[PDB]
Amino acid sequence: CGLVASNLNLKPGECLKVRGEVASDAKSFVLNLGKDSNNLCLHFNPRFNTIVCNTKEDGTWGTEHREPAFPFQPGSITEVCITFDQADLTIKLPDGHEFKFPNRLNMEAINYMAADGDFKIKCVAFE
Amino acid sequence: CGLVASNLNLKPGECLKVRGEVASDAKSFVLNLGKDSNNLCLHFNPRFNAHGDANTIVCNTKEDGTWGTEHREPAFPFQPGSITEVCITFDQADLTIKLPDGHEFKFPNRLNMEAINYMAADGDFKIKCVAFE
């Protein structure tokens, strides 16, 4: 499976920039953010067509949001940026388009990040 | 207590670039590399002080939790409160550590790691960027 990072201590206003290579045969990939594997403030699941976003609280999936698809290209290097406040997480897509996603679990920090095997993380930065 | 990363899958020849902020009160910091927390191919513990005598780079390994024979490299003048960068690569023989001034030193791959999957910083080194080149 993909890169896993803990003790991130990402605070409100701070920006998490993840650059990675989308598999040439990928039909989807996954980026999870939160406190741990069972507590996610953001399950980011683009599908090669829609973007599924959800939360997880104590292992229990929340209600999915679906955003309009982003034309991620297989075999290419793409970049996603995540910021958050008490109210919303903001997800910036490569084309500069943004959407918001509620901070339903009222997380005060993002400490956990994980990608799956369909998204090879090449670069993580905290801005 | 600092960022911890797993499933790195760093392979021979690949460069691991770690950029981070040295704590303003730091007299040293620690960056660990290996298979897991108990198995380290590199314990990178630079000790800097412009106003102290503890100036040296402590290097060691850890095998099943046990520290190996520690090596000491010449000190690097890391400045507290600054953002610094280190790049690490490896082959079967040695790990190569690239310091900010471009200076390199080597450290033996005594535990014969074929891949690095684990990295951890301490509370004195706040990682800002991790890159795989």
Side-chain angles (χ1 to χ4, degrees), chain A residues 1-10 12-16 18-20 22-23 25-26 28-76 78-85 87-91 93-94 96-119 121-126, chain B residues 1-10 12-16 18-34 36-78 80-91 93-97 99-125 127-133:
Chain A
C1 196
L3 183 146
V4 179
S6 57
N7 292 330
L8 278 54
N9 198 30
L10 192 77
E14 306 181 349
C15 155
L16 180 62
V18 184
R19 183 176 175 97
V22 179
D25 63 340
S28 67
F29 73 88
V30 173
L31 183 57
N32 290 328
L33 295 179
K35 171 145 188 171
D36 49 40
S37 60
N38 286 314
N39 295 274
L40 305 178
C41 61
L42 182 59
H43 172 66
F44 182 74
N45 179 218
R47 297 177 184 178
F48 300 68
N49 281 82
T50 179
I51 296 175
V52 169
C53 298
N54 208 347
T55 54
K56 189 193 282 190
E57 184 181 32
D58 287 285
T60 304
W61 291 113
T63 300
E64 285 180 11
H65 286 195
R66 296 198 171 193
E67 296 287 332
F70 182 88
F72 289 104
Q73 307 284 322
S76 62
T78 189
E79 185 179 298
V80 291
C81 303
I82 300 98
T83 63
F84 75 99
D85 52 43
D88 296 281
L89 282 75
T90 300
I91 297 88
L93 293 167
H97 180 52
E98 301 178 3
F99 68 88
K100 284 174 163 66
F101 182 76
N103 191 8
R104 303 188 295 209
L105 307 182
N106 204 6
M107 286 203 189
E108 76 293 353
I110 301 183
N111 276 292
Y112 174 86
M113 175 193 48
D116 77 332
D118 277 317
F119 186 56
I121 292 183
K122 294 307 285 188
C123 199
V124 186
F126 303 83
Chain B
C1 194
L3 183 146
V4 180
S6 56
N7 291 329
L8 282 195
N9 198 30
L10 191 77
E14 306 181 349
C15 199
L16 181 61
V18 184
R19 183 175 175 261
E21 174 173 354
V22 179
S24 52
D25 63 341
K27 318 300 170 172
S28 67
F29 71 87
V30 172
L31 184 57
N32 290 328
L33 293 179
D36 52 40
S37 61
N38 290 316
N39 295 274
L40 305 177
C41 61
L42 182 59
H43 173 67
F44 181 73
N45 179 217
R47 300 175 185 178
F48 36 90
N49 206 337
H51 305 87
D53 284 87
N55 283 278
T56 180
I57 296 176
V58 167
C59 299
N60 208 347
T61 55
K62 192 193 282 278
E63 182 180 30
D64 198 358
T66 302
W67 291 115
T69 303
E70 163 181 320
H71 288 193
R72 294 196 170 192
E73 296 286 333
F76 183 87
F78 289 104
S82 63
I83 295 175
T84 189
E85 185 179 298
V86 290
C87 334
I88 302 98
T89 198
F90 78 99
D91 52 43
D94 297 281
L95 281 74
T96 304
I97 299 89
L99 293 166
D101 61 340
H103 179 52
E104 299 179 2
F105 68 89
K106 282 174 161 66
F107 182 76
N109 191 7
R110 42 169 77 138
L111 305 181
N112 307 121
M113 290 201 190
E114 296 190 50
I116 302 183
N117 276 292
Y118 175 88
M119 176 192 48
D122 76 333
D124 277 317
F125 188 56
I127 291 182
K128 294 306 285 188
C129 185
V130 186
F132 303 85
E133 303 172 12

